[model samples]
Target: VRTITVASGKGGTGKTTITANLGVALAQLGHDVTIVDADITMANLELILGMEGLPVTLQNVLAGEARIDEAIYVGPGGVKVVPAGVSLEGLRKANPEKLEDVLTQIMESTDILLLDAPAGLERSAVIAIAAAQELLLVVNPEISSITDGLKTKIVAERLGTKVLGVVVNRITTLGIEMAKNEIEAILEAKVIGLIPEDPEVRRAAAYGKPVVLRSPNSPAARAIVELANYIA
Candidate 1:
């Protein structure tokens, strides 16, 4: 099983959205995938999964009151999930051994675990990326995203994480060439996927579903599916 960690150097780079869509796209290709909301401080995977009834959460496991497996919940597209729910206060109080056991359990069960890491190379993000074998750095054509992405790549490499590829979100077929060239030149990483800016993505999120499922024929959805194929 390949563990792909989806992260960004900064927040609001569409990391969660890309992860949710990629999980569904991979599932569509008949692969068993799991999306782990590793942004424990502020988890939002349940929102993208469209699973409103969060019976169990990551906090429950960390709190030592619930088994990690018990927190397993199925999403709209049949992708297994370990929702990082609310009440993530004082997680450090939990026994370190117990927390590691929970993490190990999730790592062992899944085929392709897509870790939705929070942006910014903070302590939490660093630990999250370190847990994965590969990383999918999410970026945009904008200056801030590109600049931050370069730094993120450096951190991931220094941490001994193999970078699988990059996902350029919010780009166009015509307008993205220059930015892509600049990013590749500066970061020395290949762009594995280019997800165009689409309004339907917001619509899909508003409905609590991934755009790939809600608007399969949309340009954005097709882009993610094509990228999934190439990645596989």
Candidate 2:
């Protein structure tokens, strides 16, 4: 199985949003996809997939209290989801360092594994990156975002993972956001996708649905599907 870690230098770059939607898109293409929420501290992918009140989560699997498959839940398009527990108790109980071992077990059952890595260069992020065969950096079109993405790329490469490419999220075509050329120049990586800012994304989130499923033709959703196609 191919493992792709989706990460950002910082939060609010729509990293989780891209991971969740892209997972659905990949599944729609008839691949058995597994999306793992590695952001244990600020876990919300379950909420995004309307997968709440789960008795098992990644935390349990990492802690060795549950089998990896037990934590796997089915989401839209038959996508397997391994969500992180939202409770503080669950977070405290989990050993983030065990992520790599757990991920090895998960990859055994899927065609592709998409890991939603936590923002930052902390231990959690490192563990997530270390577990993946490839990394996808998500960033907005801005100086700070690009700088952070560069840092993330450096760290991922240092950990011996090749970055697949970059995804520029929340882009605006009014020439307000940074040009794609500038972003590529700064990151020194190809821009694999450019997801436009769309209100439909917010609406879909509020309804606990992926934009790709709720508004498949929306600009943002279309971009996500394209990313999935490229990965496929």
Candidate 3:
């Protein structure tokens, strides 16, 4: 199975959004896809997938309250998801170290597993990064985003995890954004996706659903689909 965790050094670069849409896109392509909300402290992948208030979650399994299969639930686009819980208590109890075992158990059946690792280089985020087979760095086409993304690449390298590529989100022509080659030059990784900034993403999230399901032909949706194709 292919284990890929998505990360970004800075917050609000749409890392979780990309993971949610990418998982659904891969499922649409007939892949056995499973996405895990490795961001146990601030879990939102379920909300984007229209799956919230899940009784058993990844946190439950990590805290030894539920089995991995119990936490696994099918979400949008037939993608199985092990969403993290929202309770503060769950985070207090969950041992991030156990994520590796949960990841290994799910890998037995999933063809592709996309882990939504939290933004920033916290210990929880670092553990999730190391648990995955490959890392997908997410960033915006800007200096600050690119600079922070470089830090993540360095972290992944130190952890001995392969970086699949970088996804440059919210690219727009209205402003002078970093060019694709320039981003590649900085991150030292291929720019696998250049997702356009679209209002459709906001509207879709308003309804707690991914943009791909809400607007399949939207610019951001198409970009994410292409990302899924590249990974598939």
Candidate 4:
């Protein structure tokens, strides 16, 4: 199985949105995909996938209170997800060191493992990054976003993870934003996908579904589908 960790240096750049939809896109292409909500401190994958109040979670597995399979839930579009608990108490009890081992268990049943890492380079994020064979950094068309993505790339490489490429999200031809070539030049990474800004994304999210499934023909959905094919 190929392990791909979808991460970003900072939040509010649609990292989780990309990760959730990308997993659904891959699954729709007939790939067995397992997406892990590695953002333990701020678990949102369950909310995004409309899977809240799960009986078992990554926190339970990490704390050795439940088996890994117990936490795995079949989400929309046939994607399997291991969501983390939202409770602060669970966060305090769970051990990040067990992430690598948990991944080992997850890989046995899926063709691809997609880890949704936290925004910053914290211990949990590094643990998630280290467990993956490939990394996909998400960034917007802005100076600070690109810079942070570069820093994330450096850290991922230092951890012996190969960065497959960068995904530029929410791109508008507005003169205020940096151009694709310029952002690529600064980050020194090829842009694998360019997702257009689409209001359908919010609509889909509001309905607790991925745009790829909610509005497959939308600009963002089409772009994400293309990206999924590229990754596959």
| Highest lDDT scorer | 3
Predictions: Cα RMSD each: 2.2, 2.9, 2.8, 2.9
Tens-digit lDDT track of model 3 for 106-157: 9997999887887788776776788788999999987999999999999999
Enumerate residue pairs that collide in model 2: none
Model 1 poorest ten-residue lDDT run:
86-95
Q: Please give the range of 10 consecutive residues that has the lowest summed lDDT in model 3.
A: 86-95
Candidate 3 Cα misplacement greater than 4 A, ranges: 41-43, 86-99, 173-178
Which whole-number lDDT from 0 to 100 does residue 144 have in model 1? Answer: 85
Candidate 1 backbone collisions, by pair: none
Candidate 2 segments exceeding 4 Å error: 41-43, 86-100, 176-178
RMSD of 3: 2.8
- Top candidate (TM-score): 1
Global lDDT of each model? 0.81, 0.82, 0.84, 0.83
Candidate 1 lDDT over 1-232, as tens digits, reads 6888898977888778889888988988888888877775433677776777667777787876788888887786778887766421234344556656766788788778888887678766777778789999999888788889988888889999999999999897786777778778878999989999999988887789889899999999999999989977
Q: Give a tens-digit lDDT track for model 4, residues 60-139.
A: 77778999989998999999998766432345345445755666789998999998888867766776677789999999
- Per-residue alpha-carbon lDDT of model 2 for 1-232, expressed as tens digits? 8999999887878888899998999999999999877776543677777676668877677677889879988997678888766432345345545655666788998999998888777776776787788999999887788899899999888999999999999989676445887888887998888999999988877788889899989999998999999988
